[PDB]
Point group: C2
Chain length 324, copies 2
């Protein structure tokens, strides 16, 4: 509790005794992607709360009939300006839902619309527990503890605190691999990603944000289960695949996908969480935290790629530049 | 209405009456999972009391939702009825006390053996919309909502499905030249994106993973029309092919916004707009739920032309049914 963001603590204190039967994870792009692990956590842990995840404008237009006074809507926007997420917060609040927004900017429009606001840390100095993923888990595990007496909160928070060391060790261990990846993918026009379970949003974000948005590299995040029902026909020794293996219950799906890809593919970039040091993380939560480490490592891969391709990650031709 | 419902589906609905169900799980793999996306949209817009979730079959088993149990309904689909993950998912759900209904083209299959209820569907050139996999799925879905929640759209859904075959015919005729043009224009394109939102997203997903990747070895990715403006749109330029679907559901504005942008910065666009088809015999209450079926049928004609132009039969595979995996 002492490690929990003070705004999240206030939210959790107010949440006690409330009747909530549905949680909606609502954001756009990268901010939506960071919520996939939380939907996995709810699916594995929540006995009485329905969980759904939608892109912000999808949420508004789909207008779930179950959205109302017994709903909790968790929103996220880095800048706090993403118009669809701002509108989603107002829409949910107008329906009587309890709303909490996460942002890097506290005076933003999203902050102004949401009932509760939690800021996260960002940049080279940010510690895992205080990052967007860290704060989202404080809210998620906290909610489950307050509303269902879920017993994993302490281990989730202690795990997050210990996760910064895991990040730093993982990053050092993968430095040469990140450089090799950049060298090997300098001129590849398409790079697929693949993962399952709690790790699927990490692959999705890498595909839509790092590769498409920030590198203009074609991508597609293939779900490791779905792979064997169509997509796998695309692989050959020239098709690059980034394959993620986590520590959650779905790891067998990723293992199966990897085994096949090693046989018929060749240009494989494998990030396996089992190769990192989770000895200080409780077994009850290491599957839920592995995506955070995988995501952090991927960032170092992105940095090397950007440098090697002379395409800065901040470069855009449309976002913030034209009307849309 | 009820007279047009598959007899097996009618028996299931009869038995469903009075049961307490608080959660529906849509479980299948690949193309069979994609056909369930519209049903998830229907549940989101119509069900006041039933939680709906959708997963690929092996994800369902491994994720092992804690809310899966005696008050769950699990709807599964497998064409051959042999898909091992779907077969195991049926057994898994049934073992947890869930009510299970499997759709398949083969009633003597392992999936049919595991599922408590079995509903077959028709397939091929002679199959009418109402009797196809999408048709039977909606009989189950709207039927379930009518039986458990007194949902009022059942009659209009069933009548709409019956009238939808005529929509397919007119739409196919109207799109025949476009299908040929698409094939000629995409003969040598290595990557082709698809894009849609709401109840139409599974149609795009299936086209990407099944028609393009699986059956043509063409790279693809189904972009959600809302998500597009938060990263993926940076990829478009005049040389990137995009297939864009515009439906008739509440999310059409997302599709319209995406198209508008794509027309300004892209060029190789293949646009299928459900508003250009004839839904005059379909009730307004269900047009948005039925449009994806029509979009899907038209896309199949595009696939047929493409396969011919590329001399790559849709039945061709290098791994599926040929190697161990």
């Amino acid at each position: 509790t002492a490690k929990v963001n003070r705004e999240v603590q206030a939210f959790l204190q107010d949440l006690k005794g409330k009747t909530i039967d549905h949680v909606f994870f609502v954001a756009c792009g990268g901010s939506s992607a960071i919520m996939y692990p939380s939907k996995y956590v709810f699916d594995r842990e929540s006995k009485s709360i329905n969980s759904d995840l939608y892109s912000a404008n999808e949420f508004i237009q789909r207008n779930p009939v179950q959205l109302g006074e017994k709903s909790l809507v968790i929103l996220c926007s880095h800048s706090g300006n993403t118009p669809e997420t701002v509108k989603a917060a107002a829409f949910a609040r107008g329906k009587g839902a309890l709303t909490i927004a996460m942002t890097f900017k506290p005076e933003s429009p999203l902050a102004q619309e949401a009932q509760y606001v939690a800021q996260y840390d960002w940049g080279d100095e940010a510690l895992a527990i205080n990052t967007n993923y860290g704060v989202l888990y404080q809210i998620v595990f906290g909610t489950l503890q307050v509303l269902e007496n879920n017993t994993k909160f302490e281990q989730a928070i202690e795990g997050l605190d210990q996760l910064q060391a895991v990040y730093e060790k993982a990053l050092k261990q993968e430095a040469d691999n990140a450089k090799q990846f950049a060298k090997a993918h300098e001129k590849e026009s398409i790079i697929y990603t693949m993962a399952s379970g709690a790790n699927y949003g990490v692959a999705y974000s890498y595909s839509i944000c790092i590769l498409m948005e920030m590198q203009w590299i074609h991508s597609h995040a293939i779900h490791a289960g779905e792979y064997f029902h169509g997509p796998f026909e695309i692989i050959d020794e020239s098709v690059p695949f980034i394959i993620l293996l986590g520590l959650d219950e779905t790891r067998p799906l990723e293992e199966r996908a990897l085994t096949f890809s090693k046989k018929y593919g060749k240009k494989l970039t494998v990030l396996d969480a089992a190769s990192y040091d989770f000895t200080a993380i409780d077994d009850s939560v290491k599957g839920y935290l592995a995506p955070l480490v995988l995501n952090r490592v991927l960032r170092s891969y992105a940095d090397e790629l950007a440098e090697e391709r002379n395409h800065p990650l901040s470069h855009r031709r449309y976002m913030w530049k034209v009307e849309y």
